[PDB]
C-alpha cells in the first residue's frame, strides 16, 4: 500500500521533471540562457529523483514500472509566471513526499520511512530556491537582464546521477 | 507542415527514450547489470535526440512544445523479447526519420532536409547494434551470462548531451 | 529497555558476522575464491556493525558487554544453499533493526531512534545484494564458474572500521 | 507552533554558545591553555548550531529573529566545576532537541522532524565528550597538568562554519 | 575605573556583533546574498574585537567577564535602513572607543591608552565603509541589484581571529 | 588427532580474540583511549591467528569449522586486573600452542610441527608485552595517565590480516 503510493510518485516525478524541460525550453526561446541552463539542469535532477525511487523498489525486490508522462504546460505569459509554476510544483512534490512518509509510518514500514528522509531535506532546498527565483523575478521588473545576472552569479539512482 | 511532423517526432523520441528506461529497469531487476547499464545509457542518448529536435525548432524560431509521454511496455517474457522490442523500435524511428526527410524534400525545406541527415546516419548505427544484441541473445541460450559478457567486452542538443 | 534490546543486537550481530566467516570459509574450501573473498569482507562489515552498536552505548555511558557467539552453520549442500542462508539472515537482521526502531519510538528515546536510521538503510542494501547473489546463483546451474565471474565483475565504530 | 519552539532554540543555542566562551575564558585565565583552546572551539561549533537553525527557518521562508543572550556564568570554584556545567548544559540541549523532535512529530511536520535528526546525533557526541572531560577531570586531582595533557593528546549554517 | 569601562565595552562589542548577525540574516532573507555574506563576515570581525578586549584584561590579570547580549533589531523597512543602523552603530562604537582612550589618558594608564590605539584606526575604516554602503545604497534606487553588484566587486584575540 | 586439537585451537583463538574486544571495550569506557586502541588492535591480531589456523587446514584439505565463542569476561575492578587477565590468557595460549607442537611431534606430523613454529615465536612476543603492560600498570598507581602515556610512546590468514 505504501508500495502503490511510491509507484505513483515515480510517475509524479517523471512528470515534474518533464514540466521542468518545458519551462527550460520556454526560457531558452525567450533568450534567457541562464534561467534556461538552470532549469535544464533542474529537470535532470528531478529525473534523478525518479530513478532513486525506481532504485528503492528494485533494492526491495518490489514490482516497479516506468510510467508514461502527462502533458505538461508549455505556454507562459512571462518568465515570472513560469518560475511560479515551478515553485508551486515543488511545493506539491513536498506534500506528496510528506504523505509517503506518513503512510510508511502508519504501516510501520521502517525501511520506507527512512528512505524518504533524504527526499524531505532535498525538497526543503528545492522549494527554498524556486521561492528565491520568484522573489527576485518580482524585484526585477520586465528587466529580465537583472534576473539573468542573479541566476548566473548566485540514495543511489538507477542508472547513475546525471 | 514539416514543422508539425517534427514536433510529433519530439514526442516519439521522448516516448522511445522512456521505453528504453523501461527496458533498462527490466534488465536491472533480472540481475543483468551489463545489459541494464547499456540501456540506461541508450535511453539518455535517445533523450539527447529529442533535445536536438527541440534545439532545431528553437534555432529556427518555430513553435516548440515539450510533450507528454505514452505508456511504455514494462513486462517481458525474457531478455531476448526486450532486445527485440528495442530493435523493432529503432527500426520504426528510422522510418519516421526517413519520412521527415521526404516531407522536407517535398516542401523544399532545405534546412530541415540537411538537419535530418545526421539522424539518418545515427539510426543506421542504432539499428545495427540492437540487431547485433538480438542475434547474440539468440546465440546465448538461457545462458544469459554469455550475453552479459559480450555486452561488457564489445547537432546541438538543447541542454547538452549526456 | 531499548537498551536491553540493543545489547542483544550486539550479540546477534557478532553471531551474524561469525556465520559469514563460516560461509566464507565454506566457499574457500569449495575453490570459489571470488565468493569467498566477498564473504570474508562481508563478515568484517558485519563485525563493524556490532562495534557501531558497542560505540553507541559507550557514547551514552550505558552499560555494554561483549557477548559470546552462538555456534553457526558450517555445512552446506551447495553454494546456492549458503547464499540462501545469507539472504535469510540479513532479512532477519532487518527485522531486529526495525523492532529496535519501534521500541525506541515507543519509549520516545529519540537518540536511539535516529541512531538506528543508518542501519535501516544499510540493511536495504545488504538484503538487495544477498538477494541478487541468490538469483544469479539460481541462473548459474552447477556452472559455478559463471557465478564466480559475476561476483568478480559486478556511525563511528569502536576500534574503527575494517 | 514547532516554529515557535525552534525560534526559542536559536536563543538557547546562542546562550549555550556564550556560556562556552565564558568557560573558555575562565580556563584561559587559569592558565589552562589546552582546555581553553578546546572550549573556544566548542563555543564556535555551538554558534554554528544556532546558525543552522537560522538557516532552516530561512529555507522554509518562516520568520526568524536573532535574539539577545542571557547572562552566563563566569565564576567557578575550580576547573572540574566548569566542565560540570558544560556537561550539564549539553544534556539540557539534548532535552530541548528531543522535545523539538517530539513536537514536530506531533504536528506531523515531517520537514522539521528530519531536520532535527542530525542534531540528535551531534548531541550524543557532545555529551559523550563533556562526560569524558568530567571523568578525567575527576581522575586528575588538583593535578591539572594531567587534565591538560589528556585534552592535548586525545545541515547548512547561515554564514558558514568556523 | 578604565577597567570598568573596558568590561562594559566587551559587552557593547558582543552586542554590536550580534546586531550585525541580525542585519546579515535580514539581507539573507531579502535574497541579497552579497550584502548578507559581507555582514556575516562583519559580525565575526566584531566578535574578534570583543575577544581582543577580553585578551587585554587576561594579559593584565584583571577580572574579565563574558556578558549577556541585549536584544538587537531584526525588522527593517528596507536594505538602506539596515545599512543606516550599521553606520550609526559603528559611529557609536567609535565614540565609546574614544572615551576609553580619554579615561585611560586621564588615569595615566599608559598600557590601556596604547592598546586602544589600534581600535581607533580600525573604527576609521569600519565607519568609512558603512558610510560608503549607505551612499551607494542611496544611489541605487529600489534597484538593489546595483547595490549587490557593487558589494561583490568592490592585537591578539582570545581564541584567535575568525 | 592433531587435526582435532587444531580445530579446538581455532575455537580457543576466536574466544581469546573476543576476550580482547571485551578488554578493549572496558578500557574505552574507562576513558583510557590508548590502552583501548591497543587492545582493539590486539583483538584483531588474535582473530588473524585464528584465520591462520583455518588456512592451514584449508591448505591441507582437512575438515575445518568456524566455531561459536564462549562468553568472555566484561567486568573488572580496575585496569590492572584487566591487563592481568590478558597476560594470563596469552600464557595459556602459549601452553595450547606448545601442546599442539608436542602432539604433532608425537604423531610425526612434520607439516603440522613446522607450521606451529611461527606461533611459538609470536607467543613469546605477545606474552613479553602483556607482562610489560602489567609491570608498568603496577608502577603507575591509580595514576593511569602514566600508564596511558607509556602505551602511547612505547603464515597466510584465510581472508588476510587486519
Numbering used by the authors:
A (entry chain R), B (entry chain U), C (entry chain J), D (entry chain B), E (entry chain E), F (entry chain M): 10 to 163, 174 to 181
Give the article text.
Ferritins are ancient proteins that store iron away from the delicate machinery of the cell to be released again in a controlled fashion at the time of need. The iron storage mechanism involves binding of ferrous iron to ferritin protein followed by migration to the ferroxidase catalytic site where ferrous iron [Fe(II)] is oxidized to the ferric [Fe(III)] state. BfrB/Rv3841, the subject of this paper, is a non-heme binding ferritin. The Mtb ferritin BfrB adopts the highly conserved structural architecture of the ferritin family, consisting of 24 subunits arranged in an octahedral symmetry enclosing a hollow cavity for the storage of iron.
However, in accordance with the published genome annotation, we will continue addressing the protein as BfrB. This study describes the 3.0 Å crystal structure of Mtb BfrB. The molecular weight of BfrB being ∼20,000 Da, the Matthews constant (Vm) of 2.9 Å3/Da with solvent content of 57%, suggested 24 molecules of the protein in the asymmetric unit, corresponding to an entire 432 symmetric octahedron. The conserved region of each BfrB subunit is composed of the A-helix (H12 to S38), B-helix (P42 to D68), BC loop (R69 to R87), C-helix (P88 to D115), D-helix (F119 to R148) and E-helix (L153 to E163). In the present crystal structure of Mtb BfrB the metal site is not occupied, but the overall structure of the site is nearly identical to that of all the illustrated homologues. The residues involved in the ferroxidase centre correspond to the E22, E55 and H58 as ligands for the A-site and E99, E135 (along with E55) as ligands for the B-site. E54 in Mtb BfrB has a flipped orientation that is stabilized by formation of a salt bridge with R180 (unique to mycobacterium species) suggesting an altered C-site in Mtb BfrB. The 4-fold channel of Mtb BfrB is lined with N152, F154, E155 and R162, where the exterior mouth of the channel is negatively charged while the interior mouth is positively charged. The 3-fold channel is lined with R114, D115, E122, Q123, Q126 along with carbonyl oxygens of S171 and G172 pointing into the channel. Multiple sequence alignment revealed the presence of an extended C-terminal region comprising of 18 residues in mycobacterial ferritins. Although uncertainty existed in the side chain conformation of the Cflexible region (the proximal region of the stretch), the electron density for the Crigid (the distal region) left no ambiguity in the structural definition of this expanse.
